Design an enzyme around this catalytic site. Structure first.
Site, mmCIF file in Angstrom:
data_model
loop_
_atom_site.group_PDB
_atom_site.id
_atom_site.type_symbol
_atom_site.label_atom_id
_atom_site.label_comp_id
_atom_site.label_asym_id
_atom_site.label_seq_id
_atom_site.Cartn_x
_atom_site.Cartn_y
_atom_site.Cartn_z
ATOM 1 N N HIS A 127 16.245 32.526 -25.809
ATOM 2 C CA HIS A 127 17.814 32.358 -25.880
ATOM 3 C C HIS A 127 18.169 32.327 -26.895
ATOM 4 O O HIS A 127 18.492 31.701 -28.025
ATOM 5 C CB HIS A 127 18.550 31.104 -24.717
ATOM 6 C CG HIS A 127 17.815 31.430 -22.883
ATOM 7 N ND1 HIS A 127 17.326 32.308 -23.145
ATOM 8 C CD2 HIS A 127 17.277 30.134 -22.880
ATOM 9 C CE1 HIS A 127 16.934 31.968 -20.985
ATOM 10 N NE2 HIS A 127 16.084 30.772 -21.146
ATOM 11 N N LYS A 152 -17.832 20.579 -28.738
ATOM 12 C CA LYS A 152 -17.635 20.703 -29.776
ATOM 13 C C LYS A 152 -16.275 21.375 -29.852
ATOM 14 O O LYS A 152 -16.855 22.521 -29.470
ATOM 15 C CB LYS A 152 -18.524 21.088 -31.373
ATOM 16 C CG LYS A 152 -17.848 20.276 -32.603
ATOM 17 C CD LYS A 152 -18.555 19.303 -32.964
ATOM 18 C CE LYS A 152 -18.397 17.641 -34.378
ATOM 19 N NZ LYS A 152 -19.197 16.763 -33.867
ATOM 20 N N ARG A 160 22.680 42.147 -24.275
ATOM 21 C CA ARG A 160 21.886 40.485 -24.363
ATOM 22 C C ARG A 160 21.370 41.122 -25.175
ATOM 23 O O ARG A 160 20.120 41.682 -25.389
ATOM 24 C CB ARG A 160 21.426 39.941 -23.240
ATOM 25 C CG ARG A 160 19.863 40.021 -23.322
ATOM 26 C CD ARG A 160 19.532 39.287 -21.532
ATOM 27 N NE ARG A 160 18.574 39.869 -20.737
ATOM 28 C CZ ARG A 160 18.101 38.739 -19.871
ATOM 29 N NH1 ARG A 160 18.354 37.992 -19.539
ATOM 30 N NH2 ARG A 160 16.562 39.655 -19.730
ATOM 31 N N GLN A 179 10.824 40.209 -16.172
ATOM 32 C CA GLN A 179 9.945 40.638 -15.006
ATOM 33 C C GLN A 179 9.863 41.774 -14.705
ATOM 34 O O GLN A 179 8.302 42.651 -14.694
ATOM 35 C CB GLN A 179 10.025 39.780 -13.965
ATOM 36 C CG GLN A 179 10.296 38.645 -13.678
ATOM 37 C CD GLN A 179 11.520 37.846 -14.104
ATOM 38 O OE1 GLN A 179 12.222 38.599 -14.959
ATOM 39 N NE2 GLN A 179 11.782 36.486 -13.642
#
Ligand SMILES: O=c1[nH]c(=O)c2nn[nH]c2[nH]1
Ligand SMILES: O=c1[nH]c(=O)c2nn[nH]c2[nH]1
Ligand SMILES: O=c1[nH]c(=O)c2nn[nH]c2[nH]1
Ligand SMILES: O=c1[nH]c(=O)c2nn[nH]c2[nH]1
Ligand code: NA
Ligand code: NA
Ligand code: NA
Ligand code: NA
Ligand SMILES: [Xe]
Ligand SMILES: [Xe]
Ligand SMILES: [Xe]
Ligand SMILES: [Xe]
Lengths: 295, 295, 295, 295
Positions: free
Chosen positions: D256, D10, D176, D228
């Site tokens: 992004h 279930k 960034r 990473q």
């Protein structure tokens, strides 16, 4: 600590491609969402901040568009295998590519009983999918699937003879609604590489069509003893019709429609043989899975 | 402070109904999601904690199932009008009922070229909807709609000659992809009550079918100067074919598919006449609306 | 046929803006989704394929980014009013702009008990929204809202004394769970134009904060006789605290949590005073609305 | 054909439980969605329509509510282990239970700087999850996770020094935006059974809290060389702080935010050091995964 496993890449890359027949004027569209994840000797990007081993995910995105430009995008099994092979051949340190493709339906419109040359309709959110794993020196493993196929039968489904104990309230039944969303996956025998995949190209569309047809016919015609029993009959038939498939997997929700007892209101009869109005249940749902292979 | 407006009720009530033809053995299923909101002399439940004026939302839910049990659920325009009228006639202090119904597709399966008696498929998330407002002494106002119809044409769409100023970067084009999700609503002339709605019952399904057909044909055949121009042609035709409609409203996203310039890569040509691979854009999107009525 | 109403523009325009304090080094981010729809003398784009009257939706998108670059984006009431006014002043034939803005939460992170200069977390999908309608010669109408605020109280909610008839099965209760998603909107008095909006700038954030605080406190402290009664108390208080608001609207789902009777299993007691485990219901749900204004 | 693998049960079982402190009057709520799938000697339900081996999924649902009634539901690792063990001990022919639990946030409200005894808010869609596999004679394997934690930093993220070839268009950057949705999973050493799980009960909440804290601090403080590199630092720290964890897995989208060049408009400067307004991209996205274990 050590890196035990690692993969990275680009997900949710939407692609559309049009083919134009200059003779007939007929156009055909394909639209897909693609995911590509790579593995290889990339541990140092994690452990030493060494980016020199990273094929940028933005470059992976570029590669998907370039590959679509230069190759056929159908069947998706072929396109995925071309795309995966590209990465392992192009980059010495990349040893595996994992490509997932979801194909979206754009069905040619019929206008006044004739096929229109350049207009299409999304008839349903049913998808055709592939998962292609290309592993250096171990060939190409392909799993093909359909998903999002939603069906219902209003009778010819039963469920009785199950285990009854102190946890059981469910009544046995000889007549119920059965409704599910079908997810079916067939796994191909391992291919040695791109040449072998190309040699089997006609089997991909044919087997998708067979899997769909067997699923729908068996669901409609089986006087179902349970979801378990009906799904097994489906998988059995697919395996019988295509010898290059090794296993078939089905994953099926059992979407419940409950009787509504209305007897409290003027003795209104709406249960058992008198049931006409039901309440579909959004949750919970049964979930039944099976993987069927060869003796 | 004063209560300026108030309405309350039950939303997301899922209903399924089956009809069984005893002669032929054929079964037909209907599935809907229903919302009912009431208005009337209920201000004191807000201002004085006077619950005596409240028809419980749980009771509204019960009423929907009971009404479905005792009446036809198709066309949805009739069912909504029956359901709305019930509340204003049953409860003296309730003076308006607002009923919204979304009809879900369960399309009979064809197995080996013949219609199956009791198996169905959800072919697409396209919906047929109704909004019914039943107001004591002002009759029944019905707006019928279709929504979730997703189409695309790969050519025969243009967009040039628009205003150009210091905010404009868009290039004019004589050949682009056009794709949209159609939401179309037609508003019926006011009906005096249930008797009049019943008298027009055959027009409801016929007009839904006409609206769908006009939408698809016009989209496929128009060499479109803009979404604005094409949508106007659709609405014009619907109004011409059914005199009992007062207005037609269209609301259309323009779902953009962008060219991808690949020339940076080995001079690959993929723009203008050479465009084959495009990037569908999830957002932003154009949104174009129009309401068309009679001279 | 004639065009009765028309509006068009760009939806789902995602915008992020960063402010950098050169002194302190602190950065602050704003992220919004914006929709702008225009009206004016644009009928001929629909009826005659005359694109000369169309400010392209792509240009509208450009304008949103340019306006965000050159102006503050907070409070959203001011930014929306600047954006709307731009279109009606710049284009002679455009007479109304409708701007909707959804503000997404980016909350500054606390790292080791101190506010981080440039790292943020999305704490919840609660939104702050504005709808700004700028109409040439009729000023600026602003509706501010919060939505997606999900709360639950596990006791101190009652519901008894409602109408009981042959459609009623609901039992009266003096102790239940109450859970809802709050949607609250406050409508400002009409402003004559941008100068007047600028004059009230400090009131926008303060009133949002007051609306939130009143909602949470009243929900937590009211021994609720019904959703209707509790929501009225909220709106009453907001109107009392800000004289520039004309109306307050609340729209509240009643998300049901059902008792589960477990007595069939070893006499287990789980109802009424013994209730500990409940089943949240995804659907149906109550929906209760009220608009409160001044005497 | 043969059944190679099978599991059923279930899914989407929603559960709420309240604890009431009679002394203090304080109430605490827990809400979860639970999935239980069983495996064992059940092949004949598929192959021979033998329902006698099936514990009905409806009974599984009942069992979840009964178990929640009689046991603590926190930490979820303990509750899942109790629930899984139940099935393998109760039914001789069931040899594995797979339990997935998603815990939903109900955070106690602060009203006027003090904790409210019985009112709660859903602060974010972040989840705490567990997967518990209970296998007869092989003990209990538990994977704990958090998911849906959405963060953004507006500076102190770099990405340069990646592989550049004929597929690469991405520019190197020293500044960034970095934004992701965190999915982190820690896998516990195998436990021999319920007694051993009970012995470690305090470690479950503590390690969840540590995983969350390490994730947020490292994200905020790392001058990130890549996703990473930053994710590896997170996993390293979790493994160092809890010796009973064998592996840590992170799966991170790179969401992004693109610069918008506005120079075409009056030489407006909005790139590089002048970038203030960005366009968040809904798709595609990077997807970066790592599994870190012990030397
Ligand atoms: O087809 C079914 N299979 C099952 O395992 C089950 N359990 N409850 N109802 C059911 N129906
Ligand atoms: O059909 C269109 N209508 C419009 O208003 C528009 N604006 N940009 N592109 C467009 N396409
Ligand atoms: O607060 C409530 N208001 C209502 O109108 C209602 N109807 N059923 N339960 C209810 N609870
Ligand atoms: O942090 C990143 N890792 C990557 O692998 C990558 N590829 N493009 N941009 C990127 N950013
Ligand atoms: Na390689
Ligand atoms: Na009435
Ligand atoms: Na103007
Ligand atoms: Na067992
Ligand atoms: Xe099935
Ligand atoms: Xe259109
Ligand atoms: Xe409320
Ligand atoms: Xe990260």
């Amino acid at each position: 600590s050590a890196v035990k496993a690692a993969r990275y890449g680009k997900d949710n890359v939407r692609v559309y491609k049009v083919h134009k027949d200059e003779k007939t004027g007929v156009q055909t569209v394909y639209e897909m969402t693609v995911c590509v994840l790579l593995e290889g000797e990339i541990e140092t990007s994690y452990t030493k901040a060494d980016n020199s081993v990273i094929v940028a995910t933005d470059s992976i995105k570029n590669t998907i568009y370039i590959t679509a430009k230069q190759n056929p995008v159908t069947p998706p099994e072929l396109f995925g295998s071309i795309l995966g092979t590209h990465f392992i051949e192009k980059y010495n340190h990349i040893h595996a590519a994992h490509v997932n493709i979801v194909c979206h339906r754009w069905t040619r419109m019929d206008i006044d009983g004739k096929p229109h040359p350049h207009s299409f309709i999304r008839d349903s959110e049913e998808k055709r999918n592939v998962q292609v794993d290309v592993v250096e020196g171990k060939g190409i493993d392909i799993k093909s699937s359909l998903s999002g196929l939603t069906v219902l039968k209003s009778t010819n489904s039963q469920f009785w003879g199950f285990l009854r104990d102190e946890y059981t309230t469910l009544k046995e039944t000889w007549d119920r609604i059965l409704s599910t969303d079908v997810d079916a996956t067939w796994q191909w025998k391992n291919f040695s590489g791109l040449q072998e995949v190309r040699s089997h190209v006609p089997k991909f569309d044919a087997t998708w069509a067979t899997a769909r047809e067997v699923t729908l016919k068996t669901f409609a015609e089986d006087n179902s003893a349970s979801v378990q029993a009906t799904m097994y009959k489906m998988a059995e038939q697919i395996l019988a019709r295509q010898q290059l498939i090794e296993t078939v997997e089905y994953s099926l929700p059992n979407k419940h429609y409950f009787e509504i007892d209305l007897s409290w209101h003027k003795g209104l009869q709406n249960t058992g043989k008198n049931a006409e109005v039901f309440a579909p249940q959004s949750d919970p749902n049964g979930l039944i899975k099976c993987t069927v292979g060869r003796s």
